[PDB]
Subunit: 430 residues, 4 copies
């Protein structure tokens, strides 16, 4: 029924204006529009999408439509949506069903609306962050896997699901994984969360990082950026890790590596980045000092046990939205952010638009590659080619005023690499 | 009897939220809390009526209530139209403290708010002055010199203000003893530095959400605020260019990986601009005309002298308010200029200012100076004074426990060798830290 | 007029090298655990391993670790300025054949490699450990008959592996080969953190120049250039970066570095660092524009990234300040300081990467030799990387020296993340 | 002064000269002093005795003073600091140089004693000092010269603490300029210079990896700030010790853990003393230190570490290289001491780079002129150079670094209450 649901459509004015600022911050999406605009390759493809309903997503949705595609959209998180960007998109008649403060019930209903298209035909393509949509079409009625071509996935959690969905019958549709692109994982994960995380803590807490002991759980791409942020603001950062390689990395970069049992006692600020269950537990929380802040920057709220805390705290006081302060039976206080969910999105606006142009430009491509080259893409995981990975990166250099050297003909022969690309072997880790 | 507002605040309903945020802040401000335990039972500020014109913040509420717990009547205003946090103002007003402050203030209103704080509820005029920027101080001097005979003290908090103070004593135009809280090492080298390190990107990000990395930034000035401002942008991946008029500060910046060029050159390259000089005319028409599209322009030095906002408003094809304190000028060239806080302090205008922990250092010096000027007035003089180093070292000592520092005690052998006391003072007075 | 057994410069330095070897052992936890683990079972028994690696204090622990695993080892350096003379004498004094000294000639360099090929039992080498591909090349070009009995080669550097892949695309690879460089425990540690410290050390020992305030150009933002640029930035330099790859170029901009061309950097920069592995990075055009007394150094393997021959051909005067530190007076009258004749400045002007990071690279190397000697089979003719199970063991072996307390996944968590509690913890496409 | 000069190997002079030539291009302030004051020869008639590390940088200072009319004689202030090639270059030039690396304490004192009376049999009229050793020799011994000495300049925080203490005790006999506490020395040489020189000396001595290691810096002043930043940037985790709450808060706001030596001596493998105070590392701490810990001192004097106990109570002492000693403790653990506890940058490397030393030595030359020319502007007592001179020192180095400084308009300058040529800051500005 509802053409759209977006909280307050009066915010559309504000949103169009953050959109136009984002377009200036998202030159890769803009270069897609000039390069692929004339040819409109996504024509007659109706794509349901489940991603944070941010202004940067509006630029992606709108780049998709300018590339000739019908688009439905719904947020991958309850607090991920920015309500200004919601109304602005829906004021253009692109059906969007999403708002901040969703209920788990409201969250999954919106996805049901996106599977439908206003014309009526089921769908042809799918773009997802996490697996909720991907899983729903599978686990909740698969009648429309055949008509559609393929799917696109962003998060490293949801990519893990798709790799393991291909251990058996799952993946009735061919899939590209846009996370394992370097222009995504080595930028969004690391460079983005470097900006987004501290932003979210400040807005919720306005706490001083300088001189505070900080614990980062996980020293992967997200963990490396989160620790760099706090180290750069005068924080001393202890790092927890289960992988030997990442541990040596943190240690060779000046970070003490030890267990949460040790770190829960010393540190005052806690950020979970592992993508694994039960990073902060009961024993840990009771050991933390008074008014310690505990947040999670990984997909899914299973890294901290909010359930135990909600249950074993004496009092739960809501300071402001997504900021809850618990008074433990001990008398120490625990401040929780975003109920342990995606803090950058819950207590701020996520990664800036520029790094999202690298992410969503890969996604534009992934979507073109599946529909125009369905012959090339058997059902399974796929990963985009490298000259395409390099092309996303090359599209942001002009904005950054980067003057890139071109290899001499004699030079390229020496390196076995074409002058135009690709420049690195497949195994290259960057 | 024309009756007088007991307070003027945006929404008194916000009192409950402010109390909550205050309580969180108190626990991250040990120095103010320590001041309450040591001097509070002895009411050192009894009989003193302090008038305060400082950005009305959560942190400033802990300062107000600390002075009140130390036996002082307090009335407050903000030194900026955009600096006041409304939730803290409501809470302090809900404590029977006359406060006249709200975000979104007009210049006429701002002046009205300060004048309401001069006379306390019994008709008696103010004894004491706590000021940031000089506006209240100048007001009493200029318009109300009748009050200065019975004003025992003046304390000032910021660099632009201490400069006005000094040349007021130089011109003979200062008539009350004064203390320079900004040049206590615990504020100068922590607040102006470590606070702006964190407060500047908070203001920028909240208004714009802009990625610092890969971007050319300009920091006009490499003083305490500029040193903090450049370190933050460079730690976020920014390429920072600094301008400087003192050769020493330019050499400091050069030796720390920064290019030092003129603002004429930087307007070409930089997309982000922060002004921190306390000086006028740092960004001019020529500078803004050179700037790239959607360049973000902000000012962290006290007062809107550094950028020519008056030119911008008057010479733009179009001006659009994205949201409060964020305006985007569509210039004659077709380029766009994103201005933050209308050329006013971006950290308090587009965010909540410096963190509570570092503000405890500054406000602890403030409480202490107020005790000095009230309880030991005959010691002081009309001039411009600085707290003793034994007191500056105390400020720091109060904050070490919260961070977990374990300071080492000098032996009697070590003390005599260095010629100091095991208790201090530990450094010479010309020591720059 | 007879095979020398060993040729080093000053066998007197043995005691000094042996005392420095004891310190390095205590800084190389992986190699020592290799001796303790693999020593008793002697898996390199029968192997006649020829190695062409910089004859350093760190390489001596590698040689003696291979001998403790049963191997017969003979050695030459892969660069004429890299050999540390105390290390070379010590190893020679134990009786292991080593032909390496600082101050070698190109003709003496080849002589040294040729002396490592046939062992004192009169038998040619059955295993190769190369750094640069030169020993690999020589054996394929000049001595192809020896390839039937070479059960495998292991290569430590990015440039040698590029030679190996091109060899195998063509029909030119004679043996099975392992690529130690692109083990995560090498590239992301040795090339990054190693060059972070060794590049500055080299310039400092050679020049004693200040990094604070200087404009610096690093050509390349690979693993070497990332760490080189990080080092200079940490001492107060502003580092201009040149790049041909869009991905590295974006990475450098996100780390606050200006990315431009050498054409422009040659004007502003006073310190020049080349890290690409490609010829002709610094040309006559670039050297003529440089500021007076600019320092030019190359941390790439091979001296092709700068035109030293042009500097020699077209300059008014060359003065030698000290060994490996040469000042050219150009026709302009401006001065150009060249370190180590364009050869690896860390190895040439200092001692190279520190021992601890070399334990991670050399422990991969010890592992690869075992693989090729002991499991020839799973290793056909081609270029192979070590398995992640063992990549992780390299890092695991170094965590206690650094005090790191690692975390054990609960069986619940491991089943959630789909991993063994003992690894491998990541997919092979992980870029770390 | 019978020997005229005593240097280790005069045969190394040509090498030193080639190295001093490269140093001159990195030292514009001293060169500009030769340009400006060259013709006037303002220090003409000046017999200057110097007691600073005999380095290539000290040599550019020596010859700059000579360009300015002065006759100078030089000794080193540390037994291991002298660079022998530079002493040889200056010795061959005729300026009497009495310094060699690895002196003995007895030889060290005899070296300084030759510098007092110049070759014509006349005593010195000017003192230039680093550590106060020469200053105290002239006061405590040979005190008859103090009346024909117009002044002294001191480089070192230690030197000036002693100089300030001398004035309290009434013992200071000459007007003394405290060169150390000029901003262009303290905030650049002690900081930026020790950041590069400390890591150099450890590396040349040990070749140890800084990454992954735990390190402890005792003190967080100008030296300890730079020493700690240096190690943290190469991947090390730095623990800081402090007796002053202000410096300790600073170190904490920068992410460093501040704790006692008793705790850090157990975790960290690298130890550098930066306080200028006695008894920083003791037997208690040394026994708890991890096996093969590297312990060094960057303070002017070798009092922050107890080498006497290490020698007396260790099982073995093995010399790896000059100024590198590995002690085997009764525990079996090993401790590596650098340069026998003395200054490790100058002992195991070549000290601060030349560019930062130009800032320091340009202050020194200006101070010597002021005391020799404007002798009446100065009464006995410890003084500092004017801010207009300090600002100048800095201004003379901006061109080399490419710095394009902003020039204030008259409206701006009157608004700030400042001249367009300075001084631009209140004298209490800490920068
Ligand atoms: N908020 C965002 O915008 C954003 C961006 C990127 C990724 N993510 C999410 O964050 C999560 C991690 O992302 P990633 O890119 O860093 O993947 P990653 O594999 O590279 O990092 C996770 C690391 O945590 C470690 N780990 C696993 N269980 C652990 C434990 N109990 N303690 C410590 N470490 C443990 C692993 O060893 C692993 O290296 C993913 O779920 C991803 O979806 C969020
Ligand atoms: N918003 C905040 O949180 C906050 C905090 C502290 C101070 N301040 C204010 O910021 C301003 C300056 O702070 P500060 O402590 O660093 O003062 P400062 O004296 O230490 O630094 C100012 C520097 O700017 C330079 N300068 C002056 N005019 C210049 C010009 N035209 N171009 C370039 N440089 C110029 C000076 O050389 C000086 O070194 C003051 O107005 C102060 O009141 C704001
Ligand atoms: N000094 C040492 O101890 C040491 C250690 C490891 C590797 N190396 C050697 O240094 C070189 C690089 O090693 P690596 O790991 O970083 O390889 P890499 O591939 O990761 O880095 C090379 C980079 O240089 C860039 N490049 C290539 N041609 C260029 C050009 N004309 N201008 C600018 N950039 C150009 C490439 O884009 C590439 O990103 C190799 O020769 C390697 O064998 C030396
Ligand atoms: N090697 C060099 O080239 C070089 C360069 C500059 C200075 N120095 C010398 O290094 C020493 C320090 O120089 P500075 O400028 O930094 O002086 P400083 O006063 O600024 O720093 C000394 C710090 O150590 C602290 N301290 C004092 N006693 C202590 C103790 N027992 N434990 C811990 N901290 C203690 C003090 O609080 C002080 O902050 C002096 O001897 C100075 O002469 C050497
Ligand atoms: N949160 C805050 N509350 C009150 N004053 C602040 C805050 N942050 C910064 N300031 C002060 O505001 C002044 C700038 O006008 C500075 O002196 C600074 O110390
Ligand atoms: N100190 C060292 N000793 C031995 N080999 C080294 C050292 N430092 C670097 N290397 C090696 O030399 C190679 C250069 O070809 C590097 O890739 C690295 O493996
Ligand atoms: N390389 C050097 N040459 C000469 N003096 C130096 C050098 N490095 C440091 N110094 C000086 O030595 C003093 C320490 O005793 C410092 O004040 C510093 O100025």
């Amino acid at each position: 029924k509802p053409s759209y649901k977006v909280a307050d459509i009066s915010l559309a004015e504000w949103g169009r204006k953050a959109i136009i600022i984002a377009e200036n911050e998202m030159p890769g999406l803009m270069a897609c529009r000039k390069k692929y605009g004339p040819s409109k390759p996504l024509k007659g493809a109706r794509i349901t999408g489940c991603l944070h309903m941010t202004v940067q997503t509006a630029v992606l949705i709108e780049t998709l439509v300018e590339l000739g595609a019908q688009v439905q959209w719904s947020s991958c998180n309850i607090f991920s949506t920015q309500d200004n960007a919601a109304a602005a998109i829906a004021a253009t008649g692109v059906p969007v069903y999403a708002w901040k403060g969703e209920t788990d019930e409201e969250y999954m209903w919106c996805i049901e609306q996106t599977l439908v298209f206003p014309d009526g035909q089921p769908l042809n393509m799918i773009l997802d962050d996490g697996g909720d949509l991907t899983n729903l079409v599978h686990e909740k009625f698969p009648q429309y896997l055949k008509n559609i071509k393929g799917l696109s996935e962003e998060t490293t959690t949801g990519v893990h699901n798709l790799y393991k969905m291909f251990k058996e019958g799952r993946l009735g549709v061919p899939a590209i994984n846009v996370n394992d692109s370097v222009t995504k994982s080595k930028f969004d994960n690391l460079y983005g969360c470097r900006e987004s995380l501290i932003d979210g803590i400040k807005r919720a807490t306005d706490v001083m990082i300088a001189g505070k002991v900080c614990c980062v759980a996980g020293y992967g791409d997200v963990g490396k950026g989160c620790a760099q942020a706090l180290k750069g603001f005068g924080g001393r950062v202890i790092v927890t890790e289960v992988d030997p390689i990442n541990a040596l990395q943190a240690a060779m970069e000046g970070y003490e590596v030890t267990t949460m049992e040790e770190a829960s006692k010393e540190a005052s600020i806690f950020v979970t980045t592992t993508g694994c269950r039960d990073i902060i537990t009961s024993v840990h929380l009771q050991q933390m000092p008074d008014d310690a802040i505990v947040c999670n920057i990984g997909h899914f709220d299973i890294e901290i046990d909010v359930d135990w805390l909600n249950a074993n705290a004496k009092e739960k006081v809501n300071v402001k939205p997504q900021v809850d302060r618990y008074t433990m039976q001990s008398g120490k206080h625990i401040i929780l952010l975003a109920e342990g969910r995606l803090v950058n999105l819950g207590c701020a606006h996520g990664h800036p638009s520029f790094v999202m142009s690298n992410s969503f430009t890969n996604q534009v491509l992934a979507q073109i590659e599946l529909w125009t080259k369905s012959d090339k893409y058997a059902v399974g995981v796929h990963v985009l080619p490298k000259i395409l990975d390099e092309e996303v990166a090359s599209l942001h250099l002009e904005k950054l005023g980067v003057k890139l050297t071109k290899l001499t003909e004699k030079q390229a022969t020496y390196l076995g690499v074409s002058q135009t690309g690709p420049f690195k072997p497949d195994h290259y880790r960057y």
